[PDB]
Symmetry: C11
Subunit: 89 residues, 11 copies
């Protein structure tokens, strides 16, 4: 096998692998959506506690975001700093 | 392998990887939908807080939207600014 | 590889990528469906707030629709304005 | 590659892509089913108000239907108005 | 490529595409099931409203059924009225 | 291509398509299950409406069953009345 | 292609198809588990109706079981009474 | 092909098929967990009925378990009593 | 085909099949998580009955665990006691 | 087939199978999140039993974690203690 | 087979395996989102207990995060410390 063939296959698989990882993002979308809905509900109940309701929402949502970030990092690594290239040529 | 073959295979996988990434969009669709439903029953029960209800919904939905945007960005990168092309020829 | 083979593989992959992206549409379908049910519930209880309720339903649904649109756009690009074809030279 | 081979691969991929897109239809199925459920129990509680309940149900369901329609359109395009064929020759 | 090979691959991918589309059917199964559950709950609480409960159930379920029908039609087309066969030559 | 290869590939894909179609069955399983659960709590709470509850359950379940049947029909067609064979030789 | 090659491919695809069909079994698993949970809750609140509750649970579970059975039948057919073999010769 | 090749491909496909069938196990995992949850809540609130509650849970869980067993059987058949081998040699 | 090839393909497929089977473990993870939540809820309402509540939790979770175990066993069999090897050479 | 190839295919499949197994981890993520949520609202309503609530949360989460561990173990085996290499001669 | 071919195939599969593993991240996203939602509610209803509510949320979300971490570890291992390469040559 030549180098170009090697790079081609690995990068092609890397593109697919990056896309698969990004699927995980649906999770935070659902979870943070729930927290948003609970915040809306709580604000309706107590329009004056809105400031503390929103700060709590953001905090919990930020935590829920983390796995989405992990996937994005994996995808960006596969796209922009591919760790397989150095092992081929 | 010739350069055309390399571009072809890599871009083909990139198209598939792009599609896979976009699957994540279902999450925000569900999550923001829940927030939407919560807003609907809230403005019906607490009309005086309609302003704060809507603004909280939009903010909460925007956070939940983020992983959808991440995937879209990965997809647009794979289609329009493909990082693998420069690694071939 | 001739040009015909290159176009064939890229466009074939593009068709699959387009279909995969469109799967995301299930999300908004569920989320907006939830918002719809909450509107039905709310107008049954507060028929006087109907205008406010539907207005809020449509707004929240429109937001939840966005990732559905993103996928549609990615699909339409892959089908009608394929950005890979110009790099096959 | 000959032209018949080219078309065969592309149309074959297009049939798969069309099927993949149609998977999104499950979303509206779930979401609208939820709206139907809330309509049923609203009617049971306010039988006099069936007309208003139903019209709200229909409107909400119609919105939730859209991504199912997007996928159907994409599928019909790939089947009946395939945009890749003109690119092959 | 001869004609038989062309038809073989096209019809083969069509069978898979048909199967993939039919997966959407799970959605209406879940959604209409929910509507059925709410009707049961409703006839239990308001048995005198049994007539309007059922007619409401059927109507809402019929709407949620539509994407299941879309997939069925796409599958039937791929199986019995295949639109790719005339594009081969 | 000889007739045997043509049949082979088409039948093989058809077997895969049939299995894919059958995945939709999970939907009715979930949906009708929810209706059963609702019937259980209703029959306990309201023993007078027992016959109407079960009548409502069965009717709703039967409706929710349809997409399951659609898939079974597509599967049986692919297995026993394969429409692709008469297109070969 | 010789007959053994034909049988190998068709049966191999049949094995995969059978497994795919069996995935549907998760549906009844979820749905009947829900119906069981309601029976548990109902029995607790009114042991004075243990017989009626369980009888209704079984009936509703039996209905929800059906698509699971359809998949088993398809799998059993693909494994033990393969309808494709007689088509090959 | 030779016999060894025939057995190789079919048993290989059978291994994948077995794994796919086993995916259905998630269903009973979820459903029975729900029933387990309701039992915890029910036993706690109605200790005097712990016996009929637990037996109700077990019975309901056993029914929900069936599709998991169906998949296990199919998997064990593919692994230990493969019905395809006699068709190959 | 030599014996090494036969083993190679069969074991490779067995690896994929084993991974596929393990996917079902998400089910018990969800279901038992639910039972855990109901227990926490019940403990908070009746802390004196913690021992009894936990006892019920473990029982229900053990049952829900079963399909996860089935998948683990199938995977360990495919990895450590592969039943396909004796059919090759 | 040479030895290097045998190792290549088997280890390649093992990498894929390992990733597939890890998908199961989503289950414990959801279930333990639910347990976390019920605990959050429990310590709010019963700060007195805060100790018992946490200990119950952890214990329940630990049980629901098990299928996630099983998949990790299988993945680690496929990666670090691959049981197929010894069969390749 | 040469060593470059071997490394190419193994690393390509490893890229895909890594992406598949990262899909598990969706679980924590949903689960921690639920915990976040309950926290927003509880904080709004018991604003004096804000400290212990958030503390309970974080502890709960941390546990639910673990399987997400497991997948990230497997992926990072596959990308940066690939344990298959030392088996090839
Ligand atoms: C909770 C927060 C988690 C996110 C933070 C985690 C650490 C940071 C990860 C960022 C995601 C990866 O993003 C990617 O990183 C790699 C380095 O690894 C960079 O890659 C870099 O190294 C390559 C390889 O020599 C060079 O061509 C160049 O110097 C540069 O591109 C990419 O330019 C960047 O797009
Ligand atoms: C929409 C905003 C919210 C989502 C945020 C998404 C963040 C991810 C966006 C892209 C991150 C990576 O950003 C990417 O970094 C690499 C660095 O190697 C850049 O790459 C650039 O530098 C490298 C390194 O010398 C050069 O070899 C290359 O020719 C050049 O293009 C890309 O041009 C840039 O797009
Ligand atoms: C809320 C988030 C934002 C939502 C709204 C935006 C949704 C996303 C829409 C993106 C679709 C258009 O995306 C944009 O298309 C044009 C098409 O000429 C691309 O343009 C690219 O291709 C053309 C092809 O002729 C080249 O000449 C050009 O040099 C190149 O840059 C842009 O690089 C791309 O960014
Ligand atoms: C999910 C991931 C899937 C990854 C799939 C990767 C599939 C393709 C692997 C190709 O490896 C082949 O290896 C041969 C042995 O190294 C090469 O022989 C060479 O020597 C051969 C003849 O012995 C010659 O024809 C040439 O050098 C070339 O053809 C050939 O080029 C190379 O392509
Ligand atoms: C999920 C994502 C999966 C992505 C899978 C991508 C698979 C890509 C396979 C590419 O196949 C290679 O193409 C090379 C270039 O054509 C061939 O060169 C080799 O073979 C040619 C054809 O025999 C010879 O002409 C060359 O000299 C020789 O180096 C090589 O064999 C062949 O294997
Ligand atoms: C999820 C997305 C997956 C996308 C997968 C895309 C796979 C694309 C495979 C393309 O296959 C290559 O095409 C080249 C076209 O050139 C071939 O060159 C070969 O053509 C011949 C081999 O067929 C050589 O002998 C001749 O020299 C050469 O020109 C090469 O071998 C072949 O492998
Ligand atoms: C999800 C979908 C993912 C993508 C699926 C892609 C499937 C691609 C199949 C490609 O088949 C092509 O057939 C050509 C028939 O010509 C080959 O011609 C190549 O090899 C021939 C060898 O004889 C030469 O004659 C030709 O000139 C040369 O272009 C070409 O390599 C090969 O790739
Ligand atoms: C959803 C996934 C769908 C995947 C679909 C993949 C479809 C295409 C398979 C193509 O395989 C090639 O087809 C060529 C046409 O029948 C054959 O003729 C080729 O012979 C040469 C290649 O050897 C060509 O270059 C010459 O034009 C030709 O006559 C060639 O042997 C064969 O390998
Ligand atoms: C998901 C669906 C997947 C389907 C996958 C398999 C497709 C395989 C390729 C097509 O069948 C090939 O077809 C060629 C014909 O198209 C034949 O061509 C060969 O025989 C022909 C007879 O006309 C000659 O013309 C060709 O030149 C010669 O290459 C031969 O059977 C074989 O190479
Ligand atoms: C979802 C997947 C479903 C299952 C798909 C199974 C596909 C199996 C492979 C395709 O069948 C083709 O049959 C042709 C025969 O019909 C073979 O070539 C042969 O044709 C002749 C033999 O008949 C040779 O002598 C000539 O060179 C050649 O072109 C060709 O290689 C082979 O690939
Ligand atoms: C996708 C999920 C479902 C399962 C898919 C399983 C696909 C299994 C493909 C096995 O590949 C086939 O093996 C045959 C071994 O014989 C080859 O025979 C080739 O060689 C024989 C002997 O010369 C000829 O009779 C054949 O026509 C010729 O295709 C054939 O080409 C090749 O494709
Ligand atoms: C989820 C989908 C899982 C699919 C799993 C199975 C995948 C099998 C892929 C490989 O099939 C190949 O077909 C070749 C066709 O030639 C065989 O040729 C070998 O054995 C043949 C037996 O006829 C000989 O004719 C050939 O000359 C010799 O090279 C080869 O061994 C076999 O490996
Ligand atoms: C979950 C899915 C797993 C899919 C795994 C797919 C593995 C494909 C491996 C490569 O295909 C090769 O095809 C050759 C036929 O074309 C076979 O006969 C070959 O073995 C040698 C391969 O070169 C020949 O040279 C020797 O004569 C022969 O017996 C060989 O065994 C087989 O490996
Ligand atoms: C689901 C994921 C599946 C991932 C793995 C897919 C694995 C198989 C890729 C194709 O495999 C072939 O295996 C041959 C060994 O069987 C290699 O050498 C074979 O060919 C070489 C020459 O190219 C020499 O060893 C001799 O000619 C012949 O052994 C050949 O390069 C390689 O392409
Ligand atoms: Na997180
Ligand atoms: Na977000
Ligand atoms: Na949105
Ligand atoms: Na919509
Ligand atoms: Na509809
Ligand atoms: Na129906
Ligand atoms: Na049924
Ligand atoms: Na059952
Ligand atoms: Na069980
Ligand atoms: Na467990
Ligand atoms: Na965890």
């Amino acid at each position: 096998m030549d180098l170009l063939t090697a790079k081609t296959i690995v990068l092609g698989c890397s593109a697919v692998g990056a896309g698969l990882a990004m699927i995980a993002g649906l999770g935070p979308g659902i979870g943070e959506g729930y927290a948003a809905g609970k915040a809306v509900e709580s604000v309706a109940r107590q329009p004056e506690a809105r400031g503390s309701i929103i700060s709590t929402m953001i905090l919990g949502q930020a935590v829920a975001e983390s796995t989405g970030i992990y996937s994005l990092v994996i995808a960006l690594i596969l796209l922009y700093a591919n760790p397989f290239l150095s092992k081929l040529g």
